[PDB]
Amino acid sequence: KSTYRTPNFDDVLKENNDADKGRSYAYFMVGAMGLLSSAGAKSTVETFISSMTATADVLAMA
Amino acid sequence: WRTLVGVSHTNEEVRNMAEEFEYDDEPDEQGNPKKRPGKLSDYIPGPYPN
Numbered sequence: 178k179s180t181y182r183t184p185n186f187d188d189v190l191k192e193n194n195d196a197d198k199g200r201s202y203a204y205f206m207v208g209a210m211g212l213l214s215s216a217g218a219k220s221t222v223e224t225f226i227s228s229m230t231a232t233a234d235v236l237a238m239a
Numbered sequence: 240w241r242t243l244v245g246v247s248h249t250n251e252e253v254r255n256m257a258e259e260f261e262y263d264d265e266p267d268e269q270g271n272p273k274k275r276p277g278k279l280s281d282y283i284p285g286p287y288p289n
């Protein structure tokens with residue numbers, strides 16, 4: 178068999194590749210994952226930093 | 240006392256419950272001990288001293 182014959186890939190290929198929209202769906206999901214994890218990173222940092230503020234008993238004697 | 244406000248009782252209610260108990264104050268101008276009523280930053284007292 179010759180090396181110039183490409184094997185069968187028709188199980189996995191698209192409607193038409195349509196590069197306008199093969200890039201659309203992959204990058205909406207990569208953008209959503211970066212949006213949620215940047216919000217989660219903020220909430221984590223602000224939870225740890227606020228623990229260093231004056232406690233309830235110190236504010237009661239304020 | 241303060242942790243009951245907003246959970247089971249009103250602020251005005253808890254201030255009146257605490258004032259029914261006496262707490263050790265700091266000594267007077269000559270070093271003799273004093274007493275005072277309770278405030279919100281105090282802790283709920285127990286029946287026995289030891």
Ligand SMILES: CCCCCCCCCCCCCC(=O)O[C@H](COC(=O)CCCCCCCCCCC)COP(=O)(O)O
Nearest residue numbers: 210213214215216217218219220221222223224225226227
């Ligand atoms: C070294 C710290 C990392 C610990 C991770 C352990 C995972 C167990 C659950 C997390 C408990 C903390 C909850 C919290 O802080 O408040 C919660 C944060 O909620 C979240 O978004 C979950 C955070 C999950 C992490 C997201 C991935 C990237 C994080 C970046 C790390 C720098 C509550 O939010 P809030 O403070 O109420 O606005």
